[PDB]
Structure formats: structure tokens, C-alpha cells
Amino acid sequence: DFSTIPIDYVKAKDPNTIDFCLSYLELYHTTKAVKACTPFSFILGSDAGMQRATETTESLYWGKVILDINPNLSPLVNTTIVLEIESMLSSNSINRSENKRITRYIEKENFVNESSERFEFFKSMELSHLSTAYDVYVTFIGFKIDL
DSSP, rough: OOOOOOOOOOOOOOTHHHHHHHHHHHHHHHHSOOEEEEEEEEEEESSSTSOOOOOOOEEEEEEEEEEEEESSSOOOOEEEEEEEEEEEEEEHEEEEEEEEEEEEEEOHHHHHEEEEEEEEEEEEEEEEETTTEEEEEEEEEEEEEEE
């Protein structure tokens, strides 16, 4: 072997495993010095006691992000929720991180409450916009890649 910490060409061929992620980055994300990766998890929220953005920089996240919005029984303001997510899927072509936003528009009648799981491969997670009436929670279950 005598390669870097990531290991390629392993018989483990499954989309959810970190092996698929490593094999994909070593093949279609050249000019990126991939260092050791570890299974990581973190949570961002809207209420006090949590951070609105990831402190890490120049580190690629791969895994499933769980969006969660619930009502806190508070007066409404008629704003919108915006969660801007970077995207390195097309980073090689343009040498930039694509910006993707997941938005649920808030009505005074449509009393929204839903939770869902999505797959993303991003750099940083930021809650650019927020509504004080609701509760927002995002959880990441995947792997962190150091560059």
C-alpha cells in the first residue's frame, strides 16, 4: 500500500459506508490533499445553548443531515427559514463551493411541522435566517474529512 491514511480499492462497495466516500474523493476530487477521516456528529439549533454555524473550516463533511422544525407556541413574525449549505459536488469544475439553500416558507395559517433526512457533502453549515417562533434542529451523522 504505502499510500496516505485513506485506503482505496477496498472490497467494501456500499453507498452509505465511508469507503464509498473515500473512493469517490480519490477519483473525482483530485488536487485535494485528503487527510485522516473520522466518524463525526454535531447538532445546530435555534434556541440558546447552540451554535448557528460550524466552527470547523477547510474540512469536508459527508453524511446525512436531519432537518427538524417544530413550533414553540410563540407569536409569529411572518419571516422565512433559510439554511444555506455549501456543496462540493461540483467543486472540482469551478474551484468553488456551490451554495444550496433549503427554505420552508412560514405562513400565519400554514402551521408547518416536519422532519426529514437528506444527504449532503458540504464544507460549512450556516443558519443565515431564523424565525423566533419556531424551533430548528439539524443533526449530522456521517464522517468528517480533514484537508
